[PDB]
């Protein structure tokens, strides 16, 4: 084997560099030319808080098996990740670095790195995705603690010890470093804000949440204290191996990418453990805006399938908010989840309601979906009853956004209603003024439908549209649908 300082990075990276004139973002969705310019052991800024250099950890920390899966990764980025682990970690704490080559196009990307000290390469015989790939690496791990890292990261000064200390003290703690930013355009390494936590909206997409005023205030005594987080980013974390196994590893039916970070986060919290972000542990990551690799069936479908598997097993009744926020997800088969449901039962996990109240109280539950009230706007004007009642005409007036005579509802029976009065086409003759009359389910004269991107109101069964061109001559009328500005009506919820 060769010690990493002696690895021929030039020969390794040189065999896949971007040709002149070719798109430097095509293969990885990050600038490969800039990644290739960097040395495998390039220096990076110490982004840690000053108090970190004084924080201590036990001497007898458990060694870890570092698992890095990868699929068509840029050679320079993959090598740099491996070297950062070897250079920035105490050798006695790195039992091995397991590279799981998830069926990359060129087997040499991984095989060539197998000559480096402590690197073990496991190539999947077929594409497996990150979930099954991480499990393969974990299953092969010989250490008592697992460390997962994406294949485009750069570990910082004393990044490992703070993480291991947490797990050595309590095996049920799943911890992650503050993830610094490696710019996808010019690869500069920049420190992430330390006032963040992992979170998500009801569309179940991971996002970074900024701490509330009180949370920041409470950390003034010790700014580098662990940060309990509702969710971990997903690709960078440390976990006791036996705990990873007994808690259920990963849902093996999840494919490619997405949703597994949500699943393990819910599972760990609901089933007794905890998730932490450790300020003194810093690791940079090349964040991208798009995945460069393929998703069988499309990324949208795969993400929805994986997410449904997580939601259907862990969120209880709250899963309905996900389907409300993401309608397209309801029509996505997700397969059998019995093994996971049984896992939850066996582990005697707490309900999702408990998770929301005790772990993520910041996430607000949305109101139930129902018919919405609002204004029908045209320019800066709003459909106005004019203060009229039955048999009276309607018109338009400057919107005041105070409801009242400008508040309407587009009902399911297709009426345009204000309280108990509805817009009525008393005369279909083009140019006829419409009138307000009591709403009746079986009055065909009160039926309207939105058309053209919900920008107009057409009387059902006719080619007549609500028109304000007669507003100064008696009130709104029905007119042959045409390109007139006077026929534009937008429903704004309020």
């Amino acid at each position: 084997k060769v010690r990493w300082p002696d690895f021929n990075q030039e020969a390794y990276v040189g065999g896949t560099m971007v040709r002149s004139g070719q798109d430097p973002y095509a293969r990885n969705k990050f600038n490969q030319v800039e990644s290739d310019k960097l040395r495998m052991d390039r220096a990076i800024p110490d982004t840690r808080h000053d108090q970190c250099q004084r924080k201590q950890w036990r001497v007898d920390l458990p060694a870890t098996s570092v698992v890095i899966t990868f699929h068509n990764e840029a050679r320079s980025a993959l090598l740099r990740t491996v070297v950062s682990v070897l250079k920035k970690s105490p050798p006695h704490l790195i039992k091995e670095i397991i590279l799981v080559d998830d069926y990359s196009n060129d087997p040499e990307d991984g095989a060539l790195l197998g000559k480096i000290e402590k690197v073990r390469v496991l190539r999947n015989d077929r594409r497996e995705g990150l979930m099954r790939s991480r499990v393969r690496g974990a299953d092969a791990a010989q250490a008592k603690v697992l460390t997962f890292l994406d294949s485009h990261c750069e570990c910082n000064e004393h990044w490992l010890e703070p993480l291991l200390e947490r797990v050595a003290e309590d095996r049920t703690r799943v911890v992650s470093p503050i993830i610094d930013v490696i710019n996808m355009d010019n690869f500069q390494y920049v420190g992430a804000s330390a006032d963040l936590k992992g979170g998500f909206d009801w569309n179940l997409v991971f996002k970074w949440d900024y701490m509330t005023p009180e949370q920041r205030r409470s950390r003034q005594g010790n700014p580098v204290a662990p940060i309990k987080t509702p969710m971990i980013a997903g690709g960078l974390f440390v976990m006791d191996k036996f705990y990873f196994e007994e808690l259920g590893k990963y849902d093996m039916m999840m494919d490619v990418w997405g949703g597994e970070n949500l699943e393990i986060s819910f599972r760990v919290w609901q089933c007794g453990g905890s998730l932490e972000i450790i300020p003194c542990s810093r690791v940079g990551h090349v964040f991208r805006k798009q995945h460069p690799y393929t998703f069988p069936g499309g990324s949208g479908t795969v993400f929805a399938r994986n997410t449904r598997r997580a939601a259907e097993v862990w969120m209880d009744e709250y899963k309905n908010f996900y389907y409300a926020a993401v309608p397209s997800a309801r029509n996505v088969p997700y397969g059998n989840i019995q093994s996971r449901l049984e896992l939850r039962k066996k582990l005697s996990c707490k309900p999702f309601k408990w998770y929301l109240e005790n772990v993520y109280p910041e996430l607000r539950v949305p109101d139930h979906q129902d018919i919405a009230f609002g204004a029908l706007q045209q320019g800066t004007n709003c459909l106005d009853t004019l203060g009229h009642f039955a048999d009276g005409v309607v018109g338009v007036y400057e919107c005041h956004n105070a409801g009242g005579n400008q508040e309407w509802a587009l009902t399911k029976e297709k009426s345009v209603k204000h309280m108990d009065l509805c817009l009525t086409v008393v005369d279909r003759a083009p140019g006829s003024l419409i009138k307000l009359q009591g709403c009746r389910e079986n009055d065909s004269r009160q039926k309207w439908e939105q058309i053209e991107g919900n920008s107009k109101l057409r009387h059902v069964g006719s080619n007549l549209c609500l028109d304000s061109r007669t507003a100064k001559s008696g009130g709104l009328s029905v007119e042959v649908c045409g390109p007139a500005l006077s026929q534009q009506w937008k429903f704004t919820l309020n």
């Binding site: 982004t47 993830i179 930013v181 920049v190 420190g191 992430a192 804000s193 330390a194 963040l196 991971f206 996002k207 970074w208 900024y210 980013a233 997903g234 690709g235 964040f287 991208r288 805006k289 798009q290 995945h291 990324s299």
Partner: peptide, 9 residues
């Protein structure tokens, strides 16, 4: 579509 980058220091 991917893991978003956090706000920097």
């Amino acid at each position: 579509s991917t893991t978003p980058a956090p706000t920097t220091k």
